């Protein structure tokens, strides 16, 4: 129950994202003001402008934090053809003394000459990589070898993803018998083109990503793409955001015996499809347990969808930023 103000932070420009600590208490706002503002939820909760330093050129669309086992490290993207990397390093030995802090650009990936449409770190189980995508249809894949050796970045891999890259997604993987995959939603406009979302796997014997799939069905510029958190989930689900809402279930029906890789046999169902937002749906945000999805669009509303004991899906929340949402709701059959 917090009433909403239109009052905003001192950012004189559009605020792009806010990123929160993967261990808590810490947040940061990225905007078109070009200054990155690190706020820290105090013990009283009062978050104040604890840091603010310039990081890029152009509209800094996205800031992504990494777990401190990555180091207290962050990636950021903007209209600079490149991707900046900052870890916050402090002086002195933290026993009961707190010295002076300082923002560190470990690197900035020039990413050829292409604007970084999305960028984020790599998952735990696959080593420590990071992925960048651009409107070039090209995805660069950079590498840091050792734990103290952070600043250095070498393009370990690149995946050419046909149409211009817009929104990317890592597949959660925690089994040696499982593989890492990537889903790619394209915001290029072509009603002709089906499968505007492209899916790649790491075939380990080939040591390489192949195209796993496309969504031969999709001809709508994808706003964002979001795997459902699936690690105990014995298959996968995908949330796809455009003018509508696409939800797909991908179950391994045949895993091959001597021909695995390239493509593996999955059933895909359009287990949900909704226009309930009645407008273009920008983003879908998962709960970390992989059980909840939030959805927002131009109307400044968020609809909140879950699975039941038939795993089917309902909106369990409808939240208005253009108005005042109603109270509780429950139902059965």
């Amino acid at each position: 129950m917090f009433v909403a103000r239109s009052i905003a932070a001192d950012h004189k420009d559009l605020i792009h994202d806010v990123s929160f600590d993967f261990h808590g208490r810490r947040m940061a706002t990225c905007s078109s003001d070009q200054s990155v503002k690190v706020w820290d939820k105090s013990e009283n909760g009062n978050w104040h402008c604890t840091a603010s330093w310039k990081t890029h050129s152009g509209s800094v669309w996205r800031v992504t934090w990494a777990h401190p086992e990555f180091g207290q490290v962050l990636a950021s993207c903007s209209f600079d053809r490149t991707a900046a990397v900052w870890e916050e390093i402090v002086g002195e030995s933290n026993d009961k003394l707190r010295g002076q802090s300082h923002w560190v650009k470990r690197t900035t990936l020039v990413d050829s000459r292409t604007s970084v449409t999305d960028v984020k770190f790599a998952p735990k189980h696959m080593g420590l990589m990071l992925a960048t995508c651009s409107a070039d249809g090209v995805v660069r894949i950079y590498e840091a070898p050792d734990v103290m050796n952070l600043s250095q970045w070498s393009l370990q891999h690149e995946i050419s993803c046909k149409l211009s890259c817009s929104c990317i997604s890592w597949n959660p993987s925690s089994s040696r018998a499982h593989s890492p995959m990537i889903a790619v939603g394209s915001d290029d406009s072509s009603p002709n083109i089906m499968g505007k979302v492209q899916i790649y796997e790491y075939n380990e014997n080939t040591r390489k990503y192949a195209k796993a799939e496309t969504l031969m069905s999709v001809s709508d510029p994808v706003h964002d793409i979001a795997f459902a958190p699936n690690l105990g989930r014995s298959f996968h689900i995908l949330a796809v955001a455009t003018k509508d809402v696409r939800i797909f279930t991908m179950k391994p029906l045949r895993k091959e015996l001597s021909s695995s890789g390239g493509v593996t046999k999955f059933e895909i169902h359009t287990v949900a499809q909704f226009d309930n937002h009645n407008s273009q749906v920008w983003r879908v945000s998962w709960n970390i347990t992989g059980t909840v999805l939030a959805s927002s669009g131009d109307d400044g509303t968020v609809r909140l969808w879950k699975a039941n004991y038939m795993d089917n899906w309902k909106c369990i929340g409808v939240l208005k930023g253009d108005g005042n949402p109603v109270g509780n709701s429950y139902q059965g059959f």
């Binding site: 103000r5 239109s6 002195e92 026993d95 920008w282 945000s285 005042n324 949402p325 429950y330």
Partner: protein
């Protein structure tokens, strides 16, 4: 919940109803993190005013009410007692303990009730939500009694009527209020609530004190004295198990019918034809439903309506016809004034057994999966049940377990019970535990370590080692190499162990000396993993075999270490620099040929060093000094080896 897809439970934002703007989001742990963001804006124009307010939408608003902690914790306590018992006991005993725990839980909720009062009579503003929660918790008491009595013992009629009358007297508190008012104002027979209390007594089956007031009435009126005496005889004959438990129901029904027929006899005699109250009592005693429907207003309790129906007409019961009686009672009560109501239909579905739809009614009325979770544990213990079970079409247990633990994580210590209940859904629970752990801020040695304990008794070393290395490297992030060290000894990681060993060796490059040496010297056979630390410790060993001049075993250790062929060359420099005076000393164990694979490797390493880098990149008077000193050192090596060979030969004589 159990039903996991419902009509969107929207959370009101009173803001942006007049002052709108587009919304941005990030997920909280059990809360929801909303703020204003500038894209596809609902409102108008930019804003830059340094606004520090937050939007914390809480499906966990329950955490902010003070009593819920006691609620759920002591529920936890009794509950864990229940399960740690569930592996034991049998049949009759099991049933007994079921009833016991039932009474225990009700008493706990009762305690909540009285303290809840203590809060409410104090409060003048929050009293209203206290009223709401007292209402709901009373509903759970009444429903809980109903379910237990209906099911747990599965007793036959007789004791059933006894326990239901006990139920009604427990849950009805008006009669004692009328008692207090009657004793408060004038004489009981002069009290306006005299006959009101008398009717309450007739309803409650407390004919002893009912006859006590009948004595007051008969003393007051010389015309109704015989009327009171006849009624007293009726109350003497009325059923209190006309025949005992070793008898047959036939005899009890005989006595019931004798009492019945004499009551109709006295009625039709016109014996009760001059006292309105007592003749209405005669209709009641004959179970005449017109008086019951008239008193419906003083009743307010159509379950009391039905229990009166059953007692005054149906001393024997049948479960199938219980639904029939409930239907009749409900229709007759709605006849006075029909209005919408959940609880009536809920307790219906109770009598027609459908526990699951009863739960559904509860879950649409409310949002507390707690009470249902304990319902579930009971049903789990009940050794098989079926009312269209949704555990064969769903998993109510783990559903409520995870809802419950998720609510528990909301507080920085109250997650702990969530741990204790992932103790019974671990195939996702322990992993969600690590998941929420890494996500939440943490420092605490003991709670973290205990989570570790929990894990290893379950033999789950993988997440274990992950977290150990993670928090160790945070330790060193705070510049604490010591905690990193011990914790790598905890993770058993030769890699990072060798790394920080090499940090130690660079410290020796800086200072030329050892610190906290015994802290590693004590490590024993565990040294076999980190080879860099193994080398550093063996250097300590040789260093002190020098310091007490232990020539033989010093040289033997050094030989073994170099045959092991480990560590960078720039340090084997100082290694043999210190080996010098031993080589000087007259010793026969000197194996010159082994010394010379030492020196040929030295040549190899110095060649490699020169190829990889220049020995001196600094131009100073002392750089050439250091160089020519190195050549002199190897020249000394040659000459001393020559002397050692001479001595060895002169001793081979």
């Amino acid at each position: 919940m159990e039903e996991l897809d419902v009509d969107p439970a929207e959370t009101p934002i009173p803001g942006l109803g007049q002052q709108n703007r587009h919304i941005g989001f990030s997920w909280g742990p059990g809360d929801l993190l909303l703020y204003e963001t500038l894209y596809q804006k609902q409102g108008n124009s930019e804003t830059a005013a340094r606004c520090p307010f937050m939007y914390l939408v809480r499906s966990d608003e329950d955490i902010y009410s003070p009593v819920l902690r006691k609620l759920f914790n002591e529920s936890h306590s009794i509950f864990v007692g229940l399960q740690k018992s569930a592996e034991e006991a049998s049949g009759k005993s099991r049933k007994a303990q079921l009833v016991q725990v039932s009474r225990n839980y009700r008493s706990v909720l009762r305690a909540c009730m009285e303290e809840m009062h203590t809060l409410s009579e104090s409060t003048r503003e929050t009293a209203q939500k206290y009223i709401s929660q007292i209402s709901i918790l009373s509903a759970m008491e009444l429903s809980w009694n109903l379910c237990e009595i209906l099911f747990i013992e599965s007793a036959p009629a007789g004791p059933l009527l006894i326990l239901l009358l006990e139920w009604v007297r427990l849950h009805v508190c008006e009669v004692d209020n009328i008692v207090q008012d009657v004793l408060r104002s004038e004489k009981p027979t002069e009290h306006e609530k005299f006959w009101d209390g008398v009717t309450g007594y007739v309803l409650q089956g407390r004919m002893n004190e009912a006859r006590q007031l009948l004595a007051k009435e008969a003393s007051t009126s010389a015309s109704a004295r015989s009327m009171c005496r006849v009624l007293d005889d009726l109350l003497k004959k009325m059923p209190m198990l006309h025949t005992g438990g070793t008898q047959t129901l036939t005899e009890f029904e005989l006595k019931w019918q004798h009492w019945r027929e004499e009551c109709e006899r006295h009625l039709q005699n016109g014996t009760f034809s001059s006292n309105v109250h007592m003749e209405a009592v005669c209709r009641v005693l004959l179970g005449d439903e017109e008086v019951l429907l008239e008193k419906r207003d003083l009743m307010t309790t159509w379950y009391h309506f039905l229990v009166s129906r059953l007692l005054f007409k149906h001393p024997t019961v049948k479960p199938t016809e219980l639904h029939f009686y409930a239907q009749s009672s409900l229709d007759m009560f709605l006849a006075g004034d029909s209005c919408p109501e959940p609880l009536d239909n809920i307790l219906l579905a109770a009598f027609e057994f459908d526990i699951h739809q009863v739960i559904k009614e509860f879950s649409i009325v409310s949002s507390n999966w707690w009470f249902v979770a304990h319902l579930t544990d009971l049903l789990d213990h009940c050794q098989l049940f079926q009312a269209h079970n949704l555990y064969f079409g769903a998993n109510m247990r783990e559903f409520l377990l995870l809802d419950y633990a998720s609510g528990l994580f909301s507080h920085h210590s109250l997650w702990q019970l969530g741990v204790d209940y992932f103790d019974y859904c671990p195939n996702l629970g322990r992993e969600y535990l690590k998941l929420h752990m890494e996500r939440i801020p943490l420092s605490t040695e003991k709670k973290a370590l205990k989570a570790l304990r929990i894990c290893e008794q379950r033999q789950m070393t993988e997440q274990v080692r992950s977290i150990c290395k993670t928090m160790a490297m945070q330790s060193l992030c705070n510049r604490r190499l010591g905690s990193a060290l011990s914790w790598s000894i905890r993770a058993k990681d030769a890699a990072f162990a060798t790394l920080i060993s090499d940090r130690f060796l660079k410290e020796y490059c800086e200072r030329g000396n050892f610190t906290d040496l015994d802290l590693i010297d004590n490590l024993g056979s565990a040294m076999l993993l980190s080879d860099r630390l193994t080398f550093l410790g063996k250097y300590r060993e040789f260093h002190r075999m020098y310091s007490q001049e232990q020539f033989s075993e010093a040289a033997s250790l050094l030989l073994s270490l170099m045959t092991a062929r480990i560590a960078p060359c720039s340090f084997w420099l100082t290694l043999l620099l210190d080996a010098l005076p031993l080589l000087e000393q007259k010793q026969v164990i000197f194996s010159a040929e082994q010394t010379y694979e030492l020196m040929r490797c030295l040549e190899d390493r110095m060649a490699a060093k020169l190829e990889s880098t220049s020995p001196d990149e600094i131009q100073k008077q002392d750089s050439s000094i250091d160089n020519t000193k190195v050549e002199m050192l190897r020249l000394a090596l040659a000459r001393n080896l020559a002397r050692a060979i001479v001595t060895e030969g002169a001793l081979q004589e």
